[PDB]
Structure formats: structure tokens, C-alpha cells
Design a binder for this molecule. Structure first.
Ligand SMILES: Cn1cnc2ccc(Nc3c(F)ccc(NS(=O)(=O)N4CC(F)C4)c3Cl)c(Cl)c2c1=O
Length: 273
């Protein structure tokens, strides 16, 4: 069973407190990450819902997916994963401004597509792909996290949905902003978020960095009147990668490619470097 009994995890350094929980470094058969959920004590029905969502996590066994290791309840709800040695892509790109060579940028994109292709092959929609939950383990291996607990994060009363929106807006497909079309969360909305990660890798920037006001971003992207400025792509970005990024970012979701195609395009342009 995957529940870790209380008393076994030792909590260490606080890594950061986001919209939905706080991550600590921990000790449990070695280094681990422990994400304490920022939520009210669950009801019996909610506790079962939480365990059912852990069922989704358990479907993932792939080197580009952050390794689920266990969960806690009786201290308070928590998800335990491996500890990644290194930083998130957000930290590299936008905080410490690591200067990756293009070959490495493409390899990070390739591994991220590899993990997303695996998730979609297991019928998992990520729903919140973004660079601060893509980790570069040992500066080599991409690990994708923060897809766990979909109903917990989006449906439970008091799950900080307003703060989650602020933290996700830059990666959010126009139809997820509006929530009006049928099944707004889809493989294709994950593709759009991945296109924004491609924009981050290939420009070094967050999209819309000339628009100070998140409130204009949400309205203008949701109305179909704003999209990332691909003229910011670096001069050494392969044309085929710029073309792929534009496809993933299409406003009309039915026009975006899915990850087998994305992965194949990236593998091809990586050989052609
Ligand atoms: C520097 N450093 C190093 N190692 C880290 C490891 C994990 C996390 N965060 C984190 C978490 F602690 C638990 C669950 C998830 N996501 S998850 O529930 O979907 N998870 C994927 C499994 F399948 C279940 C995530 Cl992302 C961070 Cl933040 C760091 C970090 O900052």
C-alpha cells in the first residue's frame, strides 16, 4: 500500500508555498519531497476522493514523470515524491537565467514531450503544465510534476482556485480561460501549455512580458485577441521548432497537433541540428 504511516517522514527545508500546497525537503528512505496540501481536514467522502486521485498518480512509471512514492493523511494530507537534484525550468530560465545551448534546449523540449506523450498514452490530462513544475534532475533528466489531485484542486471548497488561476494564466489555453466549450481541459489544452513552455525555452522569457497587467492578459487571451509574440524567438531557434510552437499555440484547439506528432517533429529537428 502507498500510505506512509505517520512518524516515518522527517520534514526538512521549506522549498516554497504555492497556490495549493507547500513543498518541503524530507527524509523517508533517503531524500524525498513532501507536498503538504493547503486544505481543510477532509471529510470521509473527500478522503476517499483523495485516495482515488492517488490512483491516477499510481498509473505513472516513466523517467520523465516525477516519481510518486507515497502519500500521508494522518499528519495532514500530503504527496511524497522523489527529491530532484537541481532546479525547475522556471528557476533556470527566469530566475538564475541559465544559458542553455540550443542542443540542450531542444533536448529539454524533447524530454518534456516524451513525458507528456506518456501521460496522454495513460489517458491522463495534466491540466497545469508549466515551467515551475518541470524539474531538471541532475541537470540532465526532465521530470514533470503537479498533475496530481485534479478534483481536489479544482472542485473542493477552499482549494485556492482564485490563486491557482493567477499562477497558471500564462500557460492557459483560451478555451480553458473561458470554460465555455465542451470539455475545456483536453489533450489539446495540455498541448497549448506545452507551446508556452516551448516559447519560454526558445525566447528565454515568459509570454506577454510587455503587458504588466494580468487582468488584461486573461481578458485578451480569452477573447482570442492576444497570443505570444513569436518574433521574440532567438535567432538560432530552428525554423521547424518555430513552426511547431505556432501549431501548439493555435487558438482553435482542433488545429493543434497531439504529442506523438509533436515528439516526432522534435526528434527530427534534433537530428537535423
Ligand atoms: C528543488 N525541488 C526538488 N524536488 C522536488 C520534487 C517535488 C516537488 N514538488 C512536488 C511534490 F513535492 C509532490 C508532488 C508533486 N506533483 S504530483 O503530485 O503530481 N507528483 C508527481 C507524482 F506522480 C505525484 C510535486 Cl510537483 C518540488 Cl517543488 C521539488 C523541488 O522544488
Amino acid at each position: 500500500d502507498w500510505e506512509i504511516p505517520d512518524g516515518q517522514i522527517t520534514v526538512g527545508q521549506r522549498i516554497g508555498s504555492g497556490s495549493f500546497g507547500t513543498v518541503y525537503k524530507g527524509k523517508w528512505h533517503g531524500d524525498v519531497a513532501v507536498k503538504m496540501l493547503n486544505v481543510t481536514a477532509p471529510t470521509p467522502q473527500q478522503l476517499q476522493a483523495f485516495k482515488n486521485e492517488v490512483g491516477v498518480l499510481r498509473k505513472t512509471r516513466h523517467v520523465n514523470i516525477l516519481l510518486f512514492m507515497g502519500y500521508s493523511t494522518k499528519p495532514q494530507l500530503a504527496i511524497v515524491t522523489q527529491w530532484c537534484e537541481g532546479s525547475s525550468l522556471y528557476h533556470h530560465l527566469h530566475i538564475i537565467e541559465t544559458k542553455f545551448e540550443m542542443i540542450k534546449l531542444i533536448d529539454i523540449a524533447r524530454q518534456t514531450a516524451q513525458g507528456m506523450d506518456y501521460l496522454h498514452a495513460k489517458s491522463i490530462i495534466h491540466r497545469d503544465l508549466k515551467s515551475n513544475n518541470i524539474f531538471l534532475h541532475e541537470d540532465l533528466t526532465v521530470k514533470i510534476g503537479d498533475f496530481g489531485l485534479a478534483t481536489v484542486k479544482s472542485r473542493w471548497s477552499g482549494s485556492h482556485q482564485f490563486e491557482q488561476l493567477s499562477g497558471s494564466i500564462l500557460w492557459m489555453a483560451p478555451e480553458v480561460i473561458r470554460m465555455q466549450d465542451k470539455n475545456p481541459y483536453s489533450f489539446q489544452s495540455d498541448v497549448y501549455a506545452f507551446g508556452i513552455v516551448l516559447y519560454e525555452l526558445m525566447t528565454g522569457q515568459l509570454p506577454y512580458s510587455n503587458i504588466n497587467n494580468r487582468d488584461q492578459i486573461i481578458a485578451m487571451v480569452g477573447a482570442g485577441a492576444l497570443s505570444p509574440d513569436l518574433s521574440k524567438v532567438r535567432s538560432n531557434c530552428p525554423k521547424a521548432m518555430k513552426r511547431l510552437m505556432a501549431e501548439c499555440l493555435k487558438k482553435k484547439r482542433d488545429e493543434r497537433p497531439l504529442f506523438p506528432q509533436i515528439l516526432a517533429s522534435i526528434e527530427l529537428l534534433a537530428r537535423s541540428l
